[PDB]
Design a binder for this molecule. Sequence first.
Ligand SMILES: *[C@@H]1O[C@H](CO)[C@@H](O[C@@H]2O[C@H](CO)[C@@H](O)[C@H](O)[C@H]2NC(C)=O)[C@H](O)[C@H]1NC(C)=O
Ligand SMILES: *[C@@H]1O[C@H](CO[C@@H]2O[C@@H](C)[C@@H](O)[C@@H](O)[C@@H]2O)[C@@H](O)[C@H](O)[C@H]1NC(C)=O
Ligand SMILES: *[C@@H]1O[C@H](CO)[C@@H](O)[C@H](O)[C@H]1NC(C)=O
Length: 369
Amino acid sequence: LGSMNSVAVSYGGNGQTLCSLRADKANVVSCFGSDVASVYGAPPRLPLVGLTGGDGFVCGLSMGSRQPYCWGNNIYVEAGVPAVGDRHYAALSAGDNHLCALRQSASYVAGGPAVDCWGYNMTGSFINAPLLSITSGSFFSCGLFAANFTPVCWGDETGSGVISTAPKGLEFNSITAGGYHVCGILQNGQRTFCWGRSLALQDGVPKGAIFTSLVAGKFSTCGLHKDTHLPLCWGFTLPNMPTNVPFSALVAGDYFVCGLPLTPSLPQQCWGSGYPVTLPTGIAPGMCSSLPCMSGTYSLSAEVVKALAASGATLCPNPTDNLCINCSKGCPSGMIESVECTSTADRQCSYDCSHCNHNATCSAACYNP
Ligand SMILES: *[C@@H]1O[C@H](CO)[C@@H](O[C@@H]2O[C@H](CO)[C@@H](O)[C@H](O)[C@H]2NC(C)=O)[C@H](O)[C@H]1NC(C)=O
Ligand SMILES: *[C@@H]1O[C@H](CO[C@@H]2O[C@@H](C)[C@@H](O)[C@@H](O)[C@@H]2O)[C@@H](O)[C@H](O)[C@H]1NC(C)=O
Ligand SMILES: *[C@@H]1O[C@H](CO)[C@@H](O)[C@H](O)[C@H]1NC(C)=O
């Protein structure tokens, strides 16, 4: 998820691993976490200028050749350097199951593709116009035009709406993509604007917040304040960020966020930013009932019901009725059930940091001072 930076995180079923460019070394990457493939597969002496991560893989932009070099255990992302030839790339961005690479000016041809992408349902060349930056969602990638600074997205739009609902006309300084939404900092005034049919935008942007950079998970978004350089995170199923430590940059996994401290002496910190819950779909609509929800199901809160309800329509015929959704069975890799499924909420998951002894190699989301 997100864009290229000095730090990156892999996430998903294979574990959670934080990779960072060591400035004390020759811009060589060093990783740690539960995604063992993304730790020990890292190139041991390949100088890199940037990093980006996805579901079980991390890709770096080489210094020498300025081409993508990927490692990890994602079946849709090839290990090593993809079939590029002579092209060179300005930036990288990794989604769940795909990598996108913004071509350098020297490798760009007029009226031709600006981005090369590899991955599931994403392998090909895209936007036929120069872009400044690129960012990747779960199943899509976005970018800002060099001409008018307006955003454009490509890929699978299902569940997000980020391609058609893109604010073509607003000019952005930078944009970051979450799992099903995109947030950006406006060029004029540096306000934060987001789009995409996601519960990460259920409450909206924190009032009066000016950020320098943004990162986003599946259903959450974090930002660094302009002055204090302190993190401010919001979104779905988010618990009440480290308030003390200022950061120079952030990076977001699917359900955790890591930050490179502004002070180079202090080590990296990571914290959980939520957990997945079963939500009603077209195929699994959920039971509208006037009575409390039966065992094994929970009453979806009225706030999210209104958010998931179409324009000018109620989700259940009788608005007072409870919408009962099946309780989630289990937690994703690295997390364990912290709270049981009640009649009012789904089961809550937290990252299992109990097996973090010496030479245990636990999740990257468990690293605090
Ligand atoms: C911003 O600039 C881009 C690139 O110059 C524009 O994208 C092109 O717009 C023309 C005119 O509609 C289309 O014929 C092309 O197919 C577009 N190219 C691509 C790759 O999509 C974009 O329309 C401009 N937007 C604004 C608001 O100025
Ligand atoms: C692969 O991604 C597709 C996205 O395609 C885009 O949206 C559709 C509606 C068309 O306008 C197409 O030209 C666009 O490129 C998804 O529609 C499709 O379901 C995805 N397939 C799988 C197997 O995930
Ligand atoms: C729970 O799942 C079963 C089987 O997948 C389905 O038939 C049922 O409708 C679901 N219950 C609710 C309340 O959605």
